[PDB]
Design a protein around this ligand. Structure first.
Ligand SMILES: NC(=O)c1ccc[n+]([C@@H]2O[C@H](COP(=O)([O-])OP(=O)(O)OC[C@H]3O[C@@H](n4cnc5c(N)ncnc54)[C@H](O)[C@@H]3O)[C@@H](O)[C@H]2O)c1
Ligand SMILES: O=C(O)[C@]1(O)C[C@H](CP(=O)(O)O)[C@@H](O)[C@H](O)C1
Ligand SMILES: [Zn+2]
Length: 337
């Protein structure tokens, strides 16, 4: 399969399929050079699958550890010491952390070079699309970065076959977030397929729901590309979730699930949406989520206070200030579990 962006122009393709690693060469021989940035662990995993390929390998730290100024400066300096030109290209081979980072390198290298997204994780079906890239500050998640449409996104589904469950759980929180944004329809549907840990962990039919999720975000970002409207909805649970992640050092996805339950509660203490908190808590339990596990600076805020993406009812998403009280009780109400 192959989806694509629908902007007036300057649009990139999104090749999603098993073995899509093949479409890489059909771009390469058009760039001066190509600096393939790959996650340290991912390298170990697929060091051989990329030997087919003007291309120079750059091994970057494992996951979330690569998104720092230090690593940003280092990586930039190293690449510039290779007399690169504007017609060079960065090939992000790894997960969201790796793509965010490399994507920021390629966005700033000479005010912008060519960017190729090669997502290898489930959560990366989200991170690889949308054009958001960046690193972290001693202040929080994603405070420095930019919007840089990659030249192309090449998603080879064969990459998933090696993800431990922890990452399947982390990444599924995103496949689920998107279904939630598809209203009560695509939701109860996905819950009815991935009903337990076994089906999830087994990745059966995951392909179908990953494409469903890319297809979903692809509409939002084509629409509100600079997050000045509906793209704000994608921050569902990232309010409490970006705070939770950068604080317990738990998988991003895990923290998104928690910000999602949290968001439902805050929606009920405010809109009395009559959300079945106990329903979502058991779904997390049946899936295998680890039930054992700042917001004043998020990117949907203003000089007034907090700003959450609350669901009042399926197909009725809002965004609005929330007193730390409704939050104070929401994070004690969520303690009930
Ligand atoms: N629009 C955006 O810019 C955007 C959207 C969503 C999330 N994110 C970012 O994405 C990151 C979280 O996503 P992530 O979990 O995919 O990142 P990640 O790079 O941290 O990957 C998670 C872990 O899986 C390993 N891994 C990667 N490929 C693998 C594979 N195929 N098999 C086995 N293990 C593999 C990595 O080494 C790492 O330890 C965060 O940094 C988050 O802020 C960015
Ligand atoms: O616009 C997007 O692509 C996102 O809202 C971007 C956020 C990152 P941000 O909240 O740091 O922008 C990401 O976590 C979420 O899954 C989707
Ligand atoms: Zn996310």
């Amino acid at each position: 399969m192959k989806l694509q962006t629908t902007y007036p122009s300057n649009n990139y393709p999104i090749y999603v399929e098993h073995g899509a690693i093949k479409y890489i060469g059909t771009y390469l021989n058009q760039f001066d050079q190509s600096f393939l940035l790959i996650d340290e662990y991912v390298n170990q995993y697929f060091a051989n699958k990329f030997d087919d390929i003007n291309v120079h390998k750059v091994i970057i730290p494992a996951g979330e550890k690569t998104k720092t100024f230090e690593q940003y400066q280092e990586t930039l300096e190293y690449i510039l010491s290779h007399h690169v030109t504007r017609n060079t290209a960065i090939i992000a081979v790894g997960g969201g952390a790796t793509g965010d980072f490399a994507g920021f390198v390629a966005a700033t290298l000479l005010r912008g070079v060519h960017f190729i997204q090669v997502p290898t994780t489930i959560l990366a079906h989200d991170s690889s699309v949308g054009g958001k890239v960046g690193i972290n500050s001693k202040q929080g998640k994603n405070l420095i970065g930019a919007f840089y449409r990659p030249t192309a996104v090449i998603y080879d589904l064969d990459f998933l076959k090696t993800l431990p469950f922890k990452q399947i759980l982390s990444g599924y929180a995103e496949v689920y977030k998107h279904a939630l944004l598809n209203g009560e329809s695509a939701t109860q549907d996905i819950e009815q397929h991935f009903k337990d840990r076994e089906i999830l962990q087994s990745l059966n039919g995951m392909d179908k729901y990953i494409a469903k999720g890319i297809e979903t975000k692809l509409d939002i970002v084509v629409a509100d590309e600079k997050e000045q409207g509906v793209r704000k909805f994608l921050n569902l649970g990232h309010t409490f979730g970006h705070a939770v992640e950068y604080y317990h050092k738990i998988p991003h996805g895990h923290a998104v699930m928690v910000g999602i339950i949290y968001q439902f509660i805050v929606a009920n203490a405010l809109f009395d949406s009559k959300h079945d908190i106990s329903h979502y808590i058991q779904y997390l339990i049946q899936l295998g989520y680890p039930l054992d596990m700042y917001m004043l600076s998020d990117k949907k805020n203003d000089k007034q206070g907090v700003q959450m993406v609350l669901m009042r009812q399926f197909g009725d998403i809002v965004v609005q200030h929330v007193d730390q009280l409704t939050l104070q009780h929401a994070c004690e109400q969520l303690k009930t579990y």
